[PDB]
Ligand binder design. Structure first.
Ligand SMILES: Nc1nccc(-c2ccccc2)n1
Length: 154
């Protein structure tokens, strides 16, 4: 019993774009851009749509980088997050009522103000590795258990 989500990292040679979410799940943290996949929509089309809705940016080709399943204790549905990256975007990042994008130099990624799982898999993304992960959370701050492995095929 899992629900499909996407997550997109705009990762350029010296910087990455993150968004500070203003409300709802993950508010107050920097993260990639993403959300629920819709009926009749491919996962990649959903990732492209969410990048535009949340950041104002248009992406063409998205590259599969990982899959992470999240379990939140006490919540029945698992979150099956399909992670993508791109280095080629059009438009400039847009701040909205929901999201404040900002570019970060790679040595200044704000891990203390990101979801805690990012500290594990973001370094793989930065070295162009692909991965499958599973994180069991208690609330939004505590990783009870996890697994993470690099893969050749996402
Ligand atoms: N980095 C991170 N950590 C935990 C959860 C998520 C998430 C991403 C997209 C949609 C829903 C949740 N992202």
């Amino acid at each position: 019993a899992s629900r499909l989500y996407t997550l997109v990292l705009v990762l350029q040679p010296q910087r990455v774009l993150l968004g500070m979410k203003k409300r709802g799940a993950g508010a107050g943290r920097w993260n990639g851009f993403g959300g629920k996949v819709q009926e009749g929509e491919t996962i990649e089309d959903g990732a492209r749509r969410e990048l535009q809705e949340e950041s104002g940016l248009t992406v063409d080709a998205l590259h599969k980088v990982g899959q992470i399943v999240f379990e939140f204790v006490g919540e029945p549905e698992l979150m099956d997050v399909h992670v993508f990256c791109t280095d080629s975007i059009q438009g400039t990042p847009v701040e909205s009522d929901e999201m404040r994008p900002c570019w970060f130099q790679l040595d200044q990624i704000p891990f203390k103000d990101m979801w805690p799982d990012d500290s594990y898999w973001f370094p793989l993304l930065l070295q162009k590795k692909k991965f499958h992960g599973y994180f069991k959370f208690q609330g939004q701050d505590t990783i009870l258990d996890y697994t993470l492995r690099e893969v050749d095929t996402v």
